[PDB]
Write a protein that binds this ligand. Structure first.
Ligand SMILES: COc1ccc2c(OCc3nnc4ccc(-c5ccccc5)nn34)ccnc2c1
Length: 278
């Protein structure tokens, strides 16, 4: 129903919609499980990941969401190939999510590699933030790697889901929130900003430098606000450089407006990264 869309967006429908004859989808093996649906191998011949929304609004809104997301193009942001319940068609990310990749006893990223994964995330977020887009759920689980180990910020738009339900807690609005990645003010208000994405990014850097350790494991869910207000932050991982820890502390500034922009994070991290060999 093209009449129900913003007249500005009608021309973009032909570029976001995938005709079912162009897409093969392999429902025989699940590759990813989200709360809203499963993910499967797909051949579009380009390799893709096809996300079902089986488990789950306005069809017009679903399309506008897809049109917004398809226009996003950055090497460190997961693209939308198109839509085909509607199926979400995404580039295939061979090496899965960042957290599982750094936890994997196969592959041996160096400290330089790990900082580089962080830098890539920062550049993806710099792009997203320049598009005035707030991610709300930045974490290592929610970023992915392709065949060339290019890290991409994912889990947004039509790809948004809870892909690891363990790290989401019920608030009172029944919202299921990633409390251990959330900024102080967001835990209090449930409002998310680019500056709260910056807090989440600091936690992500910590994940990278610990190779995917769970943050605050001896804290129980929403008692995190209490824990933080005692004057606490995540401790410096053994292999995390001093200046990288200083960056994390800046990301966790009590005053949202004093946290660094993603541009500044790209600048600071590029510098630290350049000091390393191998
Ligand atoms: C080789 O195996 C896969 C599996 C799922 C994929 C995929 O699912 C959609 C998606 N979009 N954004 C995100 C962010 C995080 C996760 C995720 C999935 C499982 C476990 C943990 C996290 N999926 N995810 C997209 C593209 N490539 C994929 C490749």
């Amino acid at each position: 129903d093209l009449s129900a869309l913003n007249p500005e967006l009608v021309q973009a429908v032909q570029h976001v919609v995938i005709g079912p004859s162009s897409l093969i989808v392999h429902f025989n093996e699940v590759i990813g499980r989200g709360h809203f649906g499963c993910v499967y191998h797909g051949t579009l011949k380009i390799h893709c990941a096809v996300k079902s929304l089986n488990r789950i609004g306005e069809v017009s809104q679903f399309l506008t969401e897809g049109i917004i997301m398809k226009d996003f193009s950055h090497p460190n942001v997961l693209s939308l190939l198109g839509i085909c319940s509607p199926l979400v068609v995404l580039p295939y990310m061979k090496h899965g999510d960042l957290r599982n990749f750094i936890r994997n006893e196969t592959h041996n990223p160096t400290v330089k590699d790990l900082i580089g994964f962080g830098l890539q995330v920062a550049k993806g977020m710099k792009y997203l933030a320049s598009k005035k887009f707030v991610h709300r759920d930045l974490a290592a689980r929610n970023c992915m790697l392709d065949e060339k180990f290019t890290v991409k910020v994912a889990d947004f738009g039509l790809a948004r889901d809870m892909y690891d339900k363990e790290y989401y807690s019920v608030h009172k609005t029944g919202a299921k929130l990633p409390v251990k990645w959330m900024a102080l003010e967001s835990l209090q208000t449930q409002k998310f900003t680019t500056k709260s994405d910056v807090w989440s990014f600091g936690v992500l850097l910590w994940e990278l430098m610990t190779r995917g350790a769970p943050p605050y494991p001896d804290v129980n869910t929403f008692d995190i606000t209490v824990y933080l207000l005692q004057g606490r932050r995540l401790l410096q991982p053994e292999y995390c450089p001093d200046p990288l820890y200083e960056v994390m502390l800046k990301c966790w500034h009590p005053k949202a407006e004093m946290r660094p922009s993603f541009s500044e994070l790209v600048s600071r991290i590029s510098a630290i990264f350049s000091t390393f060999i191998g």
